A paper describes a structure:
Nitrogenase catalyzes the ATP-dependent reduction of atmospheric dinitrogen to ammonia through the reaction shown in Equation 12. The Fe- and MoFe-proteins are both inactivated upon exposure to oxygen, with the Fe-protein being the more sensitive of the two4.
While progress has been reported in the structural characterization of various liganded forms of the FeMo-cofactor, on-path intermediates have proved difficult to visualize due to the high protein concentration and homogeneity required for canonical X-ray crystallographic techniques. We developed protocols for use of this setup in the reproducible determination of high-resolution structures of both the nitrogenase Fe-protein and MoFe-protein and of the MoFe-protein:Fe-protein complex by single particle [name].
Numbering used by the authors:
A (entry chain F), B (entry chain E): 1 to 274
C (entry chain A): 4 to 481
D (entry chain B): 2 to 523
Amino acid sequence: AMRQCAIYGKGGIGKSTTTQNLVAALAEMGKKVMIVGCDPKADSTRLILHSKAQNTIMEMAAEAGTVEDLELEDVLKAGYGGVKCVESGGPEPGVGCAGRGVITAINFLEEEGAYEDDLDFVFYDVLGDVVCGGFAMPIRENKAQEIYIVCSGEMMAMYAANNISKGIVKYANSGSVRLGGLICNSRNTDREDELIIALANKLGTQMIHFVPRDNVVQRAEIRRMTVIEYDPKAKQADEYRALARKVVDNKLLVIPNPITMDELEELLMEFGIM
Amino acid sequence: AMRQCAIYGKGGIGKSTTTQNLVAALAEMGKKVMIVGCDPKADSTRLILHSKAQNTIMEMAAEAGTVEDLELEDVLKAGYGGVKCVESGGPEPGVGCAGRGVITAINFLEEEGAYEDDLDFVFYDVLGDVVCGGFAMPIRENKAQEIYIVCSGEMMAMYAANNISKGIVKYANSGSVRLGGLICNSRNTDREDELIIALANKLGTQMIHFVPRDNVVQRAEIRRMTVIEYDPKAKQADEYRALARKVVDNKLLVIPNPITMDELEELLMEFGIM
Amino acid sequence: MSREEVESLIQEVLEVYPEKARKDRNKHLAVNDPAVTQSKKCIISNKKSQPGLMTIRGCAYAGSKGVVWGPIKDMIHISHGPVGCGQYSRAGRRNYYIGTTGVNAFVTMNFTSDFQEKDIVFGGDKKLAKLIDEVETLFPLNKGISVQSECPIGLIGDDIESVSKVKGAELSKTIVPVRCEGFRGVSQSLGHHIANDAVRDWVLGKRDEDTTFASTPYDVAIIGDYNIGGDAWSSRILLEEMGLRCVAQWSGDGSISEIELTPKVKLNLVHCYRSMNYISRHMEEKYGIPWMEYNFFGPTKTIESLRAIAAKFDESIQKKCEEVIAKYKPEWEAVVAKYRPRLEGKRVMLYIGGLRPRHVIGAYEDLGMEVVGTGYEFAHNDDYDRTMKEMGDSTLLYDDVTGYEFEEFVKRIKPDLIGSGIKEKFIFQKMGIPFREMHSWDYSGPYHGFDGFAIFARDMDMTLNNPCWKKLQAPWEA
Amino acid sequence: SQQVDKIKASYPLFLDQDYKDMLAKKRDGFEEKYPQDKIDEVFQWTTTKEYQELNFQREALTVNPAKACQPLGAVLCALGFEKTMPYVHGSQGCVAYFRSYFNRHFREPVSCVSDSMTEDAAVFGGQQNMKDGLQNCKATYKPDMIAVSTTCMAEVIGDDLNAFINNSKKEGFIPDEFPVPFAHTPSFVGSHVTGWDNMFEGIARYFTLKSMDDKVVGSNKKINIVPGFETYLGNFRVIKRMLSEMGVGYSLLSDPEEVLDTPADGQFRMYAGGTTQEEMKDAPNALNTVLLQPWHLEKTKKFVEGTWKHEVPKLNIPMGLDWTDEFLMKVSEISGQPIPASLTKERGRLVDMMTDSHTWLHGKRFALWGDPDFVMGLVKFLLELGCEPVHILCHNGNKRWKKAVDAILAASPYGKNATVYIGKDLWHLRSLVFTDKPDFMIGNSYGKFIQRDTLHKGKEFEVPLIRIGFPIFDRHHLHRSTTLGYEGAMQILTTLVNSILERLDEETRGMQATDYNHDLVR
Ligand SMILES: Nc1ncnc2c1ncn2[C@@H]1O[C@H](COP(=O)(O)OP(=O)(O)O)[C@@H](O)[C@H]1O
Ligand SMILES: Nc1ncnc2c1ncn2[C@@H]1O[C@H](COP(=O)(O)OP(=O)(O)O)[C@@H](O)[C@H]1O
Ligand code: ICS
Ligand code: CLF
Ligand code: SF4
Ligand code: ALF
Ligand code: ALF
Ligand SMILES: [Fe+3]
Ligand SMILES: [Mg+2]
Ligand SMILES: [Mg+2]
């Protein structure tokens, strides 16, 4: 049991918001979920905890000497739907090493048995710019077995998704992690469905769901809540419920086959006009 | 002459696209500019060179021994309108250490004299997730003088801009680097301009030329060029001309006074509702 | 002298520090009082070093590669990262071994990946795999490969575990990844812990489903003895002279086969509690093997420990132990009768890593020498708890002492002899105080057992009573 | 057992019968080692040419490197300044290792501090570490200057030394005018000599870069001497003596000879001598700057030519006859002083020793390694003596240095059988001395193991080691020797010829077998 998934994608493509709304919909379906935020910004758990995470692994480790003098209950907290939430800390921008922060946080969670429960889903929300091995820590062996990439129809996000696929390939071969599929967070440029499904087909994966872009998400996040908790009768809430159900029953698990820059630009020139 | 600017902001907020369009606008005004991409994704010079910059400092250095064996002409290449383009290299995602690569590339540019005379602008397009000191290499002493933070009305974008300001504070006090202003990329949010203006006032800065969201940008960039090359008479091209003009005539250079999470939430309730 | 004066000395020494550093360092200096039940109220340890204070501590790489893994003879230990760490650690520690270096033994060799800038920027996993292949091609008689991580490996998230697994499966070799990057922990102690965990996870369980080893009831394994100057050997000859079968030695003159055979033994004799108590507890709670701390420093401790170990076996082992004691009695008695008059009443201050600051006090007292000051680089609370029962009344105790602190303590106390490492030796030799290297035995030894005791007494007399110490002041000066 | 009259240390304690029996029983019962025949076969294979081909095809594995990391050289450079504390930003294990290395080489105290960056400092940056470390070091050891280098961790995470030190100054941890020169010294770039160059460039630009306006070249009528990474105290002493005999005003920047040669008189001196800050401030006023070891002072050369505007001469290291002559003539042409009669007589005495010893020196084949400038000087001097430097290895050498040494070898008939290797470690050299055996090898203490290996192939294959270079751990007080100048050439010649003569005496000591050539007069 206990599927472990890692959320990757382009920076600012909506990985944190989408994963938090997905986890809220999952807890709505009676699923015990855990969220690990592998981002130096402790922003992966603002909606679920209804506040900024004030107890990160790195902060509590520095405030108590070393990480070997830390305990699970100091950093692990529960929010909406009983979702247990822990956040990897990290430096303020432009200093330190956030990759090492993520490495230390994941090693602490593993050593302390942060997962040994009646858990059905563990989601690692990673940042956009995977620039070192530490931010690939969630997809190592005995870690997240599925990867979901969040993308959109502007070609920079598509090139990003191709680059994360290139990076993913080495851990897919070295281990058992697999690309479950692509989540499309809408930007509504010209032809988002066609472009994203074509990119997914080229990579050998599916487009598990399409999430529209509406302002109820922003309005809900202003109140520090997920759409599911804010407006359960909203269309976006049902979209997140559909995405959750499609995640639960998903079975496609493929090693990605990234395309070259020339093939990617050919795909854009072919599926990206009118 | 010789104005050194560093483009930062939330991931995927449009730093590279806006930077390239602004650089095209500045070069059409007879100003000699050079773009340094400090992202392991060497995607910050594509719309200027009309192709992906295959040769990067890190890749060339690894192929040709070390960085000392390299030459500027092999990495510094001209493009549309006399815009010199160079890119720091980097590993594929999830491996290595891209911040060290950015440090080494920028040191190589400094040591090789890329910062010659008759160069009005040097723009460092940095990635959105400044995870280490390496990606703060552009704002080191005597490297970049002005910082432009691209933001939007989203809560996450404003939080990222405030976090980046918090990271900037140490370099601003250490050296002479300041925050020129907040370029706004429209995301079509409720009271977007109001939110950006209020956040800029709280930081002690201004919002420089809120940029509208238009698909002419998507089209131009999918045709491997800036909007200026594509449709000079388009509305967004004139907007980029206005942005370039407002950048040239800017004198508000301040050390940001970043606001806490509580003050950020108060800002969101005050200007992010209705 | 006197509990009050040494406290005043501590305060005067601490006076020069900034308030933060003074507040921190006050808790690491104490005056011994056996009226204390828990060292937590007395002295705290195993904490971060104060920056810029010139500490003596090493790193986790030193505690793992330099201390635990390095002494293993038939394994090749690769300092993964830049060139510095392995080069400075190459053959600096005299963990003695028998073998053919470069053919089937590699202890004094320095294997490294020699990271360049491109290895940092683009990762070193492929380079690590190629290095493992080259190690196989050029050293085909090695019986194991360990990858000791340096600081950049820990920083950049190189997946050395994946490389170790894949290459070990491909080559039928034990490849042990040790995440001993130097910035982890505060000292070599976390290096000990990480190395012990690596041994437990990758080596100790290889022969779990194996019963082809004949086991006798008298099987003991020496744990935490690193054969400095042959120490372990000098210890081993005693145990096997009282009937015991020494199946394993950890890890000085150690082979990976002995470590794999350790779970088959019946007793675990731990010399250095600090470095290898982790694996001793693991084996006690998994295989049911009891472990006992012993001490082979000086005749008194050696006899006491031999009788304590014998009491854990049959009557035959006890008779053999008694005959060993009676046989070796005249030799150490002659050593005492020769060297104690030369050393009686001489005061010694010690500063060593984590076991020897308290373990060698009995040996010094066997020669009439009093230990007035002692301290540890990286010991824990339990080590100081054990230290209290061994130190005399109103004796100075220090933890992670700085160069300034230790220099001032020596200036005020004025001991006859100082036992510490290479980084204090010449400082205190220039102050005119005889110095003995208590890590390397000053390139002498062994100091364990009765032969070791003879050597130890000879060295103490040789340095303490050397004529050079009477020539420090020029005759044309007051 | 021990006899109280004659106490045996480990050798020869463990040659006793009971210890030998114990070792044999332990090996038989629990070690499960390869058969002695298998071990002999593998050793013989490792001494072969096919093994050398496999060895030289290595791309990823380094075995027994002949080099160290940059911060070691940075610490050595910083030690050569007056009341200066070396301060390494990063992890403390590095500082412990640097201190132990230099302690074992010099047999002297070596002062150096760390800011003790732990995992939390790695993740969050060591700015707090820098502030507290600078304050603590200044308050505890009262240096007149703290010279800051880096370990690998601080270089990987991009710890901005400039920003950290500036913030420490503005927040009142250290006085604003307290000199804190800094240099980034990544251990994964270059070697220890690169660290020396980087530290010296940082110290130079700290004291000179911002105050060049009131500087005029030659106004002090002195000569700047940059020694580079130097671990022979006699080298500093000989450069000083030769310049002062010449009547030349000089300023030797980074002079560590006093702090590494303090007397034992009941006092410990943490600082002693060293280049004063006023010397570095006045350095741009010098007539010129001469780099003693230019091949690892490239950054210093660029800075001195581009900032101080000194036309740095193209001088090789002043090692051996020709290059000492060139150094003296260049110093003369710069300062205007003539070469005095004492120096001419010293040169003539060097030539006399050369003529006295040429018969034993001529034709001798050598394997040598070390730093590039020292190695090149040794090669040149060996060519001057009629020796053949067959195996010239420099782990931290580069292509341009290799080309220069190849051109030097081509200019002499004794460089015909010589090959220069760069990026090769001492395992490569072990193979080289097995497959193309030289008469001797010259290098640091690590070469002793190679000698051991050669002796295992037989006494006729044994290549004796001559200990010149760094580090030298198994001999005492060799750091006091000299290798530069005529005096250094004389010491090297004496060592070489007497090593040859002692080897020949050993090979002819067998009575009635080889003692017919055991001559009293050589
Ligand atoms: N379906 C969506 N509809 C509208 N806005 C969205 C949607 N998804 C994300 N966003 C908005 O865009 C911003 C993306 O920020 P974030 O979720 O943190 O991305 P990431 O974690 O990948 O960096 C959010 O603030 C959110 O307001
Ligand atoms: N004014 C704009 N109008 C339309 N699209 C934009 C605009 N600015 C940026 N984008 C689009 O948003 C996406 C963000 O990609 P990018 O510019 O590379 O962001 P970043 O450099 O911050 O990572 C791009 O595909 C780009 O086409
Ligand atoms: S392992 Fe430890 S510092 Fe127990 S790291 Fe250190 S060869 Fe010391 S006091 Mo060097 S805990 Fe051994 C030691 Fe003691 S290297 Fe040796 S002498 S008995
Ligand atoms: S605390 Fe320990 S010894 Fe230090 S680096 Fe870290 S593992 Fe190693 Fe290594 S190459 Fe030189 S000595 Fe360092 S600066 Fe890096
Ligand atoms: S790129 Fe990653 S590993 Fe390298 S310094 Fe930045 S956060 Fe650390
Ligand atoms: F804030 Al992001 F990917 F840009 F989590
Ligand atoms: F995703 Al980016 F700069 F390329 F934030
Ligand atoms: Fe000395
Ligand atoms: Mg996120
Ligand atoms: Mg960009």
